[PDB]
Structures are given as C-alpha cells and as structure tokens.
Amino acid sequence: MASISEVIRVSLQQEGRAIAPDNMNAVGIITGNQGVLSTADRYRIYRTAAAVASDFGASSQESAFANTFFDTTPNPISAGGVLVIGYWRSASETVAATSATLVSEQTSESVLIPLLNAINDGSFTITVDGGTEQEVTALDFTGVSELSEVATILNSAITGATVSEDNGYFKVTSSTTGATSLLSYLGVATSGTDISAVLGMNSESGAVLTQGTDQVVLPAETKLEGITAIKSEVNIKGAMFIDQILDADIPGIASFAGANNMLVYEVFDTGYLSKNVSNPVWAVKLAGQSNFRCLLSKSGNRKFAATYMARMHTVLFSGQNTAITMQLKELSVTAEEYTDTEIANAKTVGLDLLTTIKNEQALLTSGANDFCDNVYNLEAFRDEIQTNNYNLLKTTSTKIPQTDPGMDTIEDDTEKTCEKYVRNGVFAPGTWTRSDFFGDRQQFVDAIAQKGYYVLIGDLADQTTAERQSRVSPVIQIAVKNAGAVHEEDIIISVNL
Amino acid sequence: SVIVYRNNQSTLTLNGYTFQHLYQGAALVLTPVNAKTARTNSINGGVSISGRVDGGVHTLAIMVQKHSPDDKFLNDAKNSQEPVVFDGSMKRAYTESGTLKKATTTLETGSITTQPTKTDNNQDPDDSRTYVIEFRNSVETF
Amino acid sequence: MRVRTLDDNGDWTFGRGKADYITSKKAIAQTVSTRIKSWANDNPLAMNANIDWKDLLGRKGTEDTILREIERVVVQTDGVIRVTELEVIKTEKRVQSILLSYDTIYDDSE
Amino acid sequence: MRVRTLDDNGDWTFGRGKADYITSKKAIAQTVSTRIKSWANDNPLAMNANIDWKDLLGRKGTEDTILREIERVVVQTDGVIRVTELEVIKTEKRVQSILLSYDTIYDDSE
Amino acid sequence: MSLVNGMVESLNNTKSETEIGIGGYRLFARVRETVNYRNIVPTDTLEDGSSSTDDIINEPITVSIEGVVSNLFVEERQYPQLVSRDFSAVGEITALLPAKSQQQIQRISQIDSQIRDAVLAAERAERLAGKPYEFFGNSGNSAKTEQEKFIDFMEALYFSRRPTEVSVNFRDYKNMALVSFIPVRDNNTKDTRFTADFQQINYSTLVYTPVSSPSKSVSGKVSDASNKGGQNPESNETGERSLLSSLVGG
Structure with a gap:
C-alpha cells in the first residue's frame, strides 16, 4: 500500500512554534504554586490557552489567568509576543532527589547518522556511581536511520543507566538518585x-x-x-503576581520595575482609594515608580491585571502610529461598578478602572502616575535603541573604529531608530517644554520642534584616556517628546443666551 | 582604496573572440540606458518603488582601430544577413591593497545598434570605429 | 421645535407639562449640547445616532476627526446655521477642552 | 456543514450515525485538510477536483504555484475567510514543509 | 430642493484619519484623483417668473482614481486599519422568550449551530458591507507578491458586485460601485498603473421610517410590513410532497 501520503502529507501543527521572548511583548504571570514549575524550571512559555491548561489544568487559577489573558481580542501573541508563567517560592519547595544526567551536544540528525553508519565497532568509556570504569567495544551502528535508534543502542550498552534521545539531545541518566556522579563524559576507550x-x-x-x-x-x-530569578532568566517585559503583593513589599518591587526596564501590574481593592502616605499606591506615585502600574478592582478580581497586561503589550512597534493609548479598550473581564467620588479619587491617585457605562466596558486610566502609555512606550524605546546599537556592533566584520566617522555611524543608527519611533507614533515633533538640553540649545530645540528627536554624540577628544582604552563609545544623548494623545473632551459651548 | 590596474583597458570578450585591438581613449563605454528603479509619489505621501524591467540593458560602446582584426570582426557582425547575438564579458585584472583581484562584467544578449560613423580626415585623421552593442543584461561582480 | 427642559445636572423633568418644554434658541442649545453626547453604537434604535466615541477617544490621532465629527453633528441639527470651533487648551493633563460656537437660526432677523 | 469524522489515520467511520459527524469549525478543518490532498485528474466525476499534483511535484520550479494553488483551494472552501501561509523548512532533505494558517468563519463573533 | 439640505448632507461623509483606500487597499500610490459632480439643468427658459424654480436634478457622483501598484510600497504616515466591531447584540433582547425544557433548548442549540454555518458568512459580509478589504483580508501568503495582492483584491471587489467605500482626500464616500478598472503594464516598469472609476450609489428613503439604522437585533423588528408578489401554490412541482400520513386520516 503505497499511500498518497509519501508524496504529500497534511497534518496539524504540533509544537507551539517554539519561539523565544525576544520582542517587547513577552509578558509574564508569576505563580507561587509548585505544581509543575519548580526551581530550575522557573518559567514556561506559551502562545495558547490550551497548552497552559495541559501543563496547568483548567482548574488551577494559573490556567484561569491564562484564559482571561488570551481572551483579550488584541492579545499579545497577535503582535509578536508570548505569555510566560514564572514561579516564586511561596512556601518550602521540596526538590525531589534527582539522578545524574549527561546532556549531549545538539546533533542535527543529518550529520550524526552519516558519520555513524560507517563506524562498525563501538567504543565507550563511561562511569556510573563512580563504579568500575565501563568500556563498550562493540556498537554496530551501521543499521541506524534516526537518533532514536542510536539512543536505543546506547541504552543497551551503558549498564547502570538509561539512555534517551530528546530533540536532538542525548540524555543519559543513572538509575540511582543522590550522589550518583556520571564521572565520565564518554572518554576514549582502549579500542574501537x-x-x-x-x-x-x-x-x-x-x-x-x-x-x-x-x-x-x-x-x-x-x-x-x-x-528577580524570573527576570534574570526570561527577559519578561511585563509581569503580574497571582497572589497580591503585600503592602510592605510594594516599594521594593516598584523600584525593581524601574531598575530592570520592565513593567509590573498590580491590582488593589477599594480600601486604597486615598492619597495618604500610608496608602502604598500613592507611595509609589510619590516615589516616581512609573513602571509599577497600579490597577483598581472593587471586587478584588486579580485577573483584571492580566487582561490589562494582555491589552497593553500588544503593539507591533514597526508599523505607523501603532502606539496605542489605553482608555476605552475592550478587556476580558467583567467591569465593576464605582461611585463618582471613588472614580475621581482613582483618577487623582494613579489607579486604573474598568468601569461599566451600560453593560459596556469603559477603561479609564490615570495620569497621576505617568500614563501606562508613556511608561510602556519609553521602555520600548530604550529597548529598541539598545537592540539597534547592539545589532550595529554585531553586524560589521570590522570593529567600528573609534574615529569620528564611527561616531557618525553610531549616531546615524540611533537617529534611524528615533525616526522609526516617530513614524511609530510614540514621539512626535513639538516645542521642547523642559528646561534642559545637551548641546546648542538652539540646535536642540530646533531639532525637537522639526524632527521630534535629537541625537548628539560627544566627540572622542572629550573623554578621558581611561575611557578611551576601555573601548567604550562616548556618551550618546538622545531626547524625545511624547506624542500628544487625548483621553477626554471638555467641549465648551460658547453661550449667546 | 589603493587600486592599481594592469592592461589599462579592460579585456573584452565576445563570442569567444577577445578584443586585442582597442583605440586610444574611450575604448569601452558601458552606459546603462534606463533608470534602475522607477518610483511614484502618492497623494497621501507614500512612494511606490518598482524595479524597471529595463534595469539591466546596457550599451557597450567599442572603439576599435580603423582596420585592425577587431574592426574586421565587428564589421563582419554588422554585415551579417541576420543580426548576430553577442554574449561576452569585460574582465579587468587589478590589485586592491596589494592583493590581486579580478572584476568581471558579463554582457548578455547584445546586438549592434548604432553603427560606426566612418570618417577619413586629412588635417587630423580619426582612425576609429565605434560600434555600440546593446546587451540585454550586464552584471558586474567582484 | 419644543423639547423637554433638563435641569442643571441634566436629569429629566416631569410635571408642568407644556411648561417644562424649551421654546426655541435654547431648544437648539439643549439639542446640540446633548447631540454631541450621543455615542454612536449605543442606541439599538439609532446605531449611527451621533459620533462614535468609543472608537475616537480610544485611538491615537483623532483630534482632527473629533473636530470634523463635532462639526458634522452640530451642523446637521435642526436650527443651527454655522459653527466656529477649535481647541482652547492642549490636554491640560491629558483632557483637551474644545470651544464650540454656533449661530442658531435665530439672531438673524436684523 | 456536517461531514463524517475521520479517525487518526484518516480512514472512514461508520456507526454512531449523526455522531460521527463533525459539527463545525472542525468540519472546515477536516474539509480543508483533505481538499489539499485531492489530486486533480483523479476523480472521473471531478477531473478538476483540486490542485494537480502529478504535474506540480514532478516539475522543477513550481513552489510559487504550489503555494498559489493551495491558497486557491483553501480560500475556495465553504467556511474559511483568510489564509496566512508560507514555507517553514527548505527541503530538509528534499521535502519542503509549508505552514498553512487560515481563519475559519468562526472565531469572528467578538 | 431645500438650500438647507446642502451643507447638512454635504458633511455627511467625513473622512476618518485611517484613510481607507479603494476599500481598505491603500498599498498603492494615487497618481491622480478626481470626482465628477454633475447636474441636469433643464435647458429652456423656465416658465413662470415668480416660483417655477426647483429644477436642478442631481446626479450620481463619480470618483476616478488612477495610481500605481508596486511590489514594495512604503506608506508615509497613516494609522492602522482596525477591524470593525461586531455590534450585533447591542439591542439583543431575550428573556421574554418562552421557558422550554432542556434538549428542547439544546435542540434549538443544534439548529443554531447548524444554520450559523450557512448564514454567518453573509452576516459578516453585511457587517463589513462598505469595506471589502478586511472582508477578503490581507492575502497572508508569502508566495504572492504585492501585485498579486492588488490584482486579486481588485478582481474580488469587481466580481463581488457589491458597492465599496472609496476615499478621496477629505471625503470617504460610502457606497461607491466599481465602474471601470483598467490596470496597465508598460514594458519599461514592473509596476501596474491602474485607473478605477467608481460611481456613487445614492439612495434615499421613500417610506416613513422612525429609526434610521438600527441594530441587527431590531432591524427586522422595526421593519414595516414587506410585500411579496402572488403565486399559485397549487401549481408547483419542485416540492409537491404528498400529504403527510398524519393528515389523511387526521
């Protein structure tokens, strides 16, 4: 039965595209439940609700948060983004004893097999549990067509341990657990x-x-x-906690949000609609922690953050004017009902609201703390100039010489990035309102007023010889002006009685 | 850069016959006749960039000696009953920063377009023939 | 055109029939004032009731279209003639306040 | 649209009438999945059944036309709207695997 | 008729910033762009000298757009085109409908799942009536170059035989019908130079309608009594099913 299938096969996509959190929209949800993400498995990456379920079960609150995440219609995976579940040790993780492992090099299966099939005899030296050195002197690899088969051969050869193949990797695990060293890296044998x-x-x-x-x-x-352990592993750019951050720990994480060039979304209940110092959200606002976005949910419905996160990190920063504001955008959670006094307090404190108008969501976002728009967009800009400068220092075969043409190279690349982010809708030309600048104030203000951005790089001869042989480029100072978005409208009718 | 040629005029080959006799002066002039990419401007402001299909068609102008075998070859091509197709290359050997190197300009699907303007002068003779071939595609590489 | 007056906060008025009705030149004022306030895809009986707010205050770069749509609503009102409207503050925090002036069909009797 | 489900290996299913039938959004999935697999001059009852494989995998330089014909078959399917498809590997030995993504008429109810 | 109607419904088409193109396909360049307002003024000197005016019959505006489409168009400054919302259930008004048992409900659920598969396509079409581009959609396949996309979208719009909305700068006219589409391909430029004349389909309401444009949820509800012609059911063959066995007795 020679099937049609061997000239065409048509199946269903199986792996979740196996991408990595590269862009800005790599958002996270931090759990604290040691179900499947234990330490050293600090994160897992997903692009669909069902996979999060299959690793987490539609019953666990983590899958619930994923469900309310992906249910936002313009969710992050629609603009080059991923969801990632983290793990902070909530209480006394017990890591089960492991057995020694030995993960081999990434082998393509197109080169390992042709090289193996010529090797008649085998030759291994392995050691398990530090026992007697084991030498394997016969492995007729001739009859092998895929890495699974060489995996089986090694499994039959290495006594005291099991051999598996997995995504082109060769894992070799001893049976015994705990102080079970596989001393050998498969050393050279005496023959074969x-x-x-x-x-x-x-x-x-x-x-x-x-x-x-x-x-x-x-x-x-x-x-x-x-x-931090998640952040030092995933390059998350927006995070939430399933469990609510204690008051005493809000400033810390708030500072963290700034110091790691990321956003952290956290929701608070009604009791925080004050502006006293003791109120943690206002403490964030006074401290300037503009990256620690605070949200308001009367019921305490934590999921409001995820959808909010799932609504923000959703802009492909490459098309024109794709930079979006936040207000009045559909979310994946039922709004709540608020009075006018409390909604005004939320406006003037920094919280954000998904409030009903009539069975219809109305997201109102604050400007007390800097608008989520502004913080998120500025983070995208720092990330993108970092990426473009890195790509410039990476692309060239030469070394980007420390000459004025080199600085013009770097400054031109930075200017290209700035022009992209002006075409991107984030920064727009305007009269620079602040009272500080870099070089010629006339030059600076004119460039802002006409292009929207200014990029000045100090010349080489203005740095110490300590900073010249450190192979460090001069300080690159770039200034931008946020585009002037609108959130309300106070239409004034001119009275003529 | 530091570029030192050899054999001042590039070596031209057509139909397996290499021009060993070029006039002094503008012996070979490879003029591209049409603009590479034509572009159009929209009302709103965008621009539509589009490669010309004529993007490669070049005219190689050849100044051969008034009666040297190169002139005989090109003249025989001119006098053929049916247009003859030329398919050759301009190869130039040169050194960059002291390293020997070759630049190759392949010329594809050409025919004699503008015939030479034959002049025999007394006061100052001009013993040149300028045959202009129009190759469909000329690709330089190095 | 008559229309029921609304009190200061803008709730409805019942009682004093034929007297809670605005007569004119103020009926136009009330009717423009709350035609501006009629979100588009609100009313199932008029889904293009007036200008679409959930899709104009939720998107960047619509100030020109906000103004054009306000002029559309105002001009297409029974009783107005002209308009004279522009923006007076520049999102003093992020809320912009626009100034709208229109000539009713009255005050043109010379 | 209903259609009899096929099991994993793709053979037919009898028994459980009215229950071996795929309901929707998966009926479209099955029907596209095996519309791609319908060689053209196979069926004497539909000789232009679907795209012609014996004359596209047997000739050099058809990848663009393979893709255009796959888009033709998919788009001309009762239940699909758009497509988003390209080639993901580059004939890892000589077999190229293309990735085909389409938006069924479902999941557009907002 | 009235002079007042002029300004009123002259502003009735306001161009959004997003700048819909030939219906959402803005990925070309507009070399030229014209509209033709015409009028029929009856010629002979009008009869009375007092009131015999109201004799400027209006005309269908045509809009001519000639542009070029290239493989690589870089658009300068225009906002993204966002998918319009499905505001169909805005007035959807249940809960007065009867109480009926389970698997009497679910039988209705199966019927609904059964004919949604056959109606939802045209329902989306009418939801997206003006703008065909996001109905047909971005082509999405990497094989088809940009001129592929322009030609297949134009053919889809042309065979669609449905009016589209067309934007000349300062106006996004609402119901343009594709009248003529001529793409030309010189042998000195790989682009396509296309001229498209559209003609507005202007149509007013003759009959008393209190509601201008309602939701789908009440559009039939407020509809007036529609009329179909007569027909002779006794003389039909395509469905001459016999009398049900449950009726012959009764």
Whole structure:
C-alpha cells in the first residue's frame, strides 16, 4: 500500500512554534504554586490557552489567568509576543532527589547518522556511581536511520543507566538518585573507533554533566523579590503576581520595575482609594515608580491585571502610529461598578478602572502616575535603541573604529531608530517644554520642534584616556517628546443666551 | 582604496573572440540606458518603488582601430544577413591593497545598434570605429 | 421645535407639562449640547445616532476627526446655521477642552 | 456543514450515525485538510477536483504555484475567510514543509 | 430642493484619519484623483417668473482614481486599519422568550449551530458591507507578491458586485460601485498603473421610517410590513410532497 501520503502529507501543527521572548511583548504571570514549575524550571512559555491548561489544568487559577489573558481580542501573541508563567517560592519547595544526567551536544540528525553508519565497532568509556570504569567495544551502528535508534543502542550498552534521545539531545541518566556522579563524559576507550567525540558526549565537547544532586534538598521560602530569578532568566517585559503583593513589599518591587526596564501590574481593592502616605499606591506615585502600574478592582478580581497586561503589550512597534493609548479598550473581564467620588479619587491617585457605562466596558486610566502609555512606550524605546546599537556592533566584520566617522555611524543608527519611533507614533515633533538640553540649545530645540528627536554624540577628544582604552563609545544623548494623545473632551459651548 | 590596474583597458570578450585591438581613449563605454528603479509619489505621501524591467540593458560602446582584426570582426557582425547575438564579458585584472583581484562584467544578449560613423580626415585623421552593442543584461561582480 | 427642559445636572423633568418644554434658541442649545453626547453604537434604535466615541477617544490621532465629527453633528441639527470651533487648551493633563460656537437660526432677523 | 469524522489515520467511520459527524469549525478543518490532498485528474466525476499534483511535484520550479494553488483551494472552501501561509523548512532533505494558517468563519463573533 | 439640505448632507461623509483606500487597499500610490459632480439643468427658459424654480436634478457622483501598484510600497504616515466591531447584540433582547425544557433548548442549540454555518458568512459580509478589504483580508501568503495582492483584491471587489467605500482626500464616500478598472503594464516598469472609476450609489428613503439604522437585533423588528408578489401554490412541482400520513386520516 503505497499511500498518497509519501508524496504529500497534511497534518496539524504540533509544537507551539517554539519561539523565544525576544520582542517587547513577552509578558509574564508569576505563580507561587509548585505544581509543575519548580526551581530550575522557573518559567514556561506559551502562545495558547490550551497548552497552559495541559501543563496547568483548567482548574488551577494559573490556567484561569491564562484564559482571561488570551481572551483579550488584541492579545499579545497577535503582535509578536508570548505569555510566560514564572514561579516564586511561596512556601518550602521540596526538590525531589534527582539522578545524574549527561546532556549531549545538539546533533542535527543529518550529520550524526552519516558519520555513524560507517563506524562498525563501538567504543565507550563511561562511569556510573563512580563504579568500575565501563568500556563498550562493540556498537554496530551501521543499521541506524534516526537518533532514536542510536539512543536505543546506547541504552543497551551503558549498564547502570538509561539512555534517551530528546530533540536532538542525548540524555543519559543513572538509575540511582543522590550522589550518583556520571564521572565520565564518554572518554576514549582502549579500542574501537571512538563514538564519544562525534556524539557530543565528550568532555571537551559542550556536554552538560549536571551531577546527581544530593538527596532531597529543601530550598527555603523566598520573598516576592524572587521575581528577580524570573527576570534574570526570561527577559519578561511585563509581569503580574497571582497572589497580591503585600503592602510592605510594594516599594521594593516598584523600584525593581524601574531598575530592570520592565513593567509590573498590580491590582488593589477599594480600601486604597486615598492619597495618604500610608496608602502604598500613592507611595509609589510619590516615589516616581512609573513602571509599577497600579490597577483598581472593587471586587478584588486579580485577573483584571492580566487582561490589562494582555491589552497593553500588544503593539507591533514597526508599523505607523501603532502606539496605542489605553482608555476605552475592550478587556476580558467583567467591569465593576464605582461611585463618582471613588472614580475621581482613582483618577487623582494613579489607579486604573474598568468601569461599566451600560453593560459596556469603559477603561479609564490615570495620569497621576505617568500614563501606562508613556511608561510602556519609553521602555520600548530604550529597548529598541539598545537592540539597534547592539545589532550595529554585531553586524560589521570590522570593529567600528573609534574615529569620528564611527561616531557618525553610531549616531546615524540611533537617529534611524528615533525616526522609526516617530513614524511609530510614540514621539512626535513639538516645542521642547523642559528646561534642559545637551548641546546648542538652539540646535536642540530646533531639532525637537522639526524632527521630534535629537541625537548628539560627544566627540572622542572629550573623554578621558581611561575611557578611551576601555573601548567604550562616548556618551550618546538622545531626547524625545511624547506624542500628544487625548483621553477626554471638555467641549465648551460658547453661550449667546 | 589603493587600486592599481594592469592592461589599462579592460579585456573584452565576445563570442569567444577577445578584443586585442582597442583605440586610444574611450575604448569601452558601458552606459546603462534606463533608470534602475522607477518610483511614484502618492497623494497621501507614500512612494511606490518598482524595479524597471529595463534595469539591466546596457550599451557597450567599442572603439576599435580603423582596420585592425577587431574592426574586421565587428564589421563582419554588422554585415551579417541576420543580426548576430553577442554574449561576452569585460574582465579587468587589478590589485586592491596589494592583493590581486579580478572584476568581471558579463554582457548578455547584445546586438549592434548604432553603427560606426566612418570618417577619413586629412588635417587630423580619426582612425576609429565605434560600434555600440546593446546587451540585454550586464552584471558586474567582484 | 419644543423639547423637554433638563435641569442643571441634566436629569429629566416631569410635571408642568407644556411648561417644562424649551421654546426655541435654547431648544437648539439643549439639542446640540446633548447631540454631541450621543455615542454612536449605543442606541439599538439609532446605531449611527451621533459620533462614535468609543472608537475616537480610544485611538491615537483623532483630534482632527473629533473636530470634523463635532462639526458634522452640530451642523446637521435642526436650527443651527454655522459653527466656529477649535481647541482652547492642549490636554491640560491629558483632557483637551474644545470651544464650540454656533449661530442658531435665530439672531438673524436684523 | 456536517461531514463524517475521520479517525487518526484518516480512514472512514461508520456507526454512531449523526455522531460521527463533525459539527463545525472542525468540519472546515477536516474539509480543508483533505481538499489539499485531492489530486486533480483523479476523480472521473471531478477531473478538476483540486490542485494537480502529478504535474506540480514532478516539475522543477513550481513552489510559487504550489503555494498559489493551495491558497486557491483553501480560500475556495465553504467556511474559511483568510489564509496566512508560507514555507517553514527548505527541503530538509528534499521535502519542503509549508505552514498553512487560515481563519475559519468562526472565531469572528467578538 | 431645500438650500438647507446642502451643507447638512454635504458633511455627511467625513473622512476618518485611517484613510481607507479603494476599500481598505491603500498599498498603492494615487497618481491622480478626481470626482465628477454633475447636474441636469433643464435647458429652456423656465416658465413662470415668480416660483417655477426647483429644477436642478442631481446626479450620481463619480470618483476616478488612477495610481500605481508596486511590489514594495512604503506608506508615509497613516494609522492602522482596525477591524470593525461586531455590534450585533447591542439591542439583543431575550428573556421574554418562552421557558422550554432542556434538549428542547439544546435542540434549538443544534439548529443554531447548524444554520450559523450557512448564514454567518453573509452576516459578516453585511457587517463589513462598505469595506471589502478586511472582508477578503490581507492575502497572508508569502508566495504572492504585492501585485498579486492588488490584482486579486481588485478582481474580488469587481466580481463581488457589491458597492465599496472609496476615499478621496477629505471625503470617504460610502457606497461607491466599481465602474471601470483598467490596470496597465508598460514594458519599461514592473509596476501596474491602474485607473478605477467608481460611481456613487445614492439612495434615499421613500417610506416613513422612525429609526434610521438600527441594530441587527431590531432591524427586522422595526421593519414595516414587506410585500411579496402572488403565486399559485397549487401549481408547483419542485416540492409537491404528498400529504403527510398524519393528515389523511387526521
């Protein structure tokens, strides 16, 4: 039965496109439940509700938050973005004892097999549990068509351990758990053509050899500042916590939001609609923590943050004027009912509201703290100038010489980025209202008023010789003016009685 | 850069016959006849950039000696009963920063368009023939 | 044209029939004043009731279209003739206040 | 539109009448999935059944026309609206795998 | 008729900033752009000298747009075209409908799932009536170059035989019908130079309608009694089903 299938196959997409959080819209939800994300598995990346469910179950609140996330119609994955679930140790994680592992090099299966099929005899030296050195002197790899088969061969060869293949990796795990070192990286044997080096298991090769950890280990109970562990692994650009951040810890994370060039969204209930110092949200507003976005939900409905996050990080920063404001945009959560006094207080404190008008959502966002628009857009701009300068220092085969033409290169690239983000709707030309500048004030103000951005790079001869042999480029000063978006309208009728 | 040629005028080959006799002066002039990409401006402000299909068609102008075998070859091509197709290349050997290098300009699907203007002068003779071939596609590379 | 007057805060008025009705030149004033306030896809009985706000205050770069649509609503009102309207503050925080002036069909009797 | 479901390997299903039928949004999925697989001059009852494979995988330089014909088949399907498809690998040995994404008439109810 | 109507419905088409193109396909360049307001003024000297005016019959505006489409168009400054909302259930008014049992409800659910598959396409079409581009949609396939997209969209609009909305600067006319579409391809430029004449389909309401444009949820509800012609059911063959066995007795 020679099927049609061997000239065409038509199946369903299986892996979630396996992308990585590169763009700005790589948003996170931090759980604290040690169901599947334990330490050293601090994050998982998703682009659909169902996968989050299958790893989390439609019952666990984490899948619920994913459901209210992806349900926002212009959700992040529609503009080059991902969702990522983090994990902060809420209470006394118990990491089960592992067994020693040995992950081999990334082998393409198009080169490993042709090299293997010529190797008649086998040759391994492996050690498990530090036992007697084991030498494998016969592995008739001739009859092999895929890495699963060489995996089976190695499984039959290495006594005391199991061999598996997984996404082109060769994992080798000893049976015993706890102080179970696989001392060998598949060293050279006394006879037989060496398979070790070609596999990638070799010690000189880039093979991870995580030794069997000691028996069951207790990490202590961390603080919400454990978000740092997520941030130092994922390049999240917007995060939430399933569990509400305690008051005493809000400033810290708030500072964190600024210091890591990211956003953190956190919701508070009705009791925080004051402007006293003790009220943490106003403490954030006074501290200037513009990256710690505060949201308001009368019921306490935490999910309001996720959808809000899922509504913000949704702008493809490459088309024209794709920079969006926030107010009056459809979310994935039922609005709540607020009085006029409390909604005014929320406006004047910094919180944000998804309030009913008539069965119809109305998102009203504050400007007490800087508008989520402005903070998010400025973060995108810093990220994009960083990316463009990095791509310039990466692209060229030469070294980008420390000459004035080189600085003109770098300044032109920065100006190209600025022009993109003016075409992008974020910054628009206007009369620079602040009272500080970089160079010629006339030059500066004219450039802002006509192009919207200014990029001045100091010349080489204006830096110390300590900063000249440090191979560091001069200070690049760029100034921008936010576009003048509108949120309300106070139409005044001119009375003629 | 520092560019030192050899054999001042580039070596021209057509139909497996390499021009060993070029006039002094503008021996070879490869003029592209049409603009590469034509563009149009919209009312709103955008621009529509579009490559010309004529983007490659070049005219190679050749100044051969008034009766040297190169003139005989080009004249025989001119006098053929049916237009003859030329498919050759201009190769120039040169050194950059002291490294030997070659620049190749392949000429594809040409025919003699503008015939030479034959002049025999007394006071100051002009013993040149300028054959202008119009290759469909000329690609330089190096 | 008659129309029921609204009190200061803009709630309805019942009682004093034929007397809670605005007569003219003020009926036009009230009717323009709250024609501006009629979001478009609100009324199932008039889904293009007036200008679309949820799709104009929720998108960047609509000030010109806000103004054009306000002129559209005002001019297409039974009783007005001309308009004279522009923006007076520049989003003093982020709220812009526009000034709208129109010549009713009255005050043209010379 | 109903259509009999096919099991994993794609053979037919009998029994459970009115229940082996795919309801919707998956009926479109199945019907596109095996409209792609319908060689043209196969069916004597529809000789232009779908795109012609024996004359497109047997000739050099048809990738663009493979893609255009796949878009033709998919778009001309009862239940689809748009497509978004391109080639993801580059004949990893000599087999190229293309990625085809289409928006059914469902999931547009807002 | 009235002089007042002039300004009133002259502003009735306001151009949004997003600048819909030939219906959402703005990915070309407008080399030229004209509109033709015409009028029929009856010629001979009008009869009375007192009141025999009201004799300037109006005309269907035509809009001519000639432009060029290239493989690579870079648009200068225009806001994204966002998908219009499905505001169909704005007045949807249930809860007066009867109480009926389960799997009497769910039987209705299956019927609804059964004919939504056959109606929802045209429902979306009418929802997106003016603008065909986001109905047909971005082509989405990497094989088809940009001129592919322009030609197949234009053919879809032309075979669609549905009026589209066309924007000349300062106006987004609401019901333009594609009258003539001539794309030309010189042999000295790979682009396509196309001239498209549209003609407005202006149509007013003869009959008393209190509601201008209601939701789909009340559009039939406020409809006046529609009229269909007669027909002779006794003389039909295409459905001459016999009498149900449950009726012959009764």
